[PDB]
Amino acid sequence: ANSFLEEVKQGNLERECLEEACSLEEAREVFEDAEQTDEFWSKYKDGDQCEGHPCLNQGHCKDGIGDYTCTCAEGFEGKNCEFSTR
């Protein structure tokens, strides 16, 4: 397959290649992901877990299949930082 890969403008984990950006051709060997090779795959098909904006109140988001993670700022609260204390 010769396309954006011939010159991978840039390969990210599951957050950037969440769409047609990549899937296995470019998102493989681009990261030290040794176990993510499998873990990353097999249990993915979830939008990457960050798709949908699980975090809230200016909360960041650390994906990685096997579920994801979020990040509330200083003055935030709730699972998705929903309760912006400030």
Tokens representing residue 65 in the block = 């299949």
Q: Which domain holds residue 24?
A: 1-46
The residue behind tokens 């090779």 is 37
Q: 22 with 53, same domain?
A: no
Same-domain status, 51 and 41: no
Residue type, 41: W
The count of structural domains within the chain is: 2
Q: Are residues 5 and 37 in the same domain?
A: yes
CA distance 72 to 58: 7
Count helices and strands in the chain by DSSP H and E runs: 0, 2
Beta pairing, strands 69-71 & 60-62: antiparallel
Pairwise CA distance, residues 37 & 86, whole Å: 40
State the Cα–Cα distance between residues 41 and 54, nearest whole angstrom.
Answer: 20
DSSP state letter for 70 = E
Q: Which CATH number does the domain housing residue 32 bear?
A: 4.10.740.10
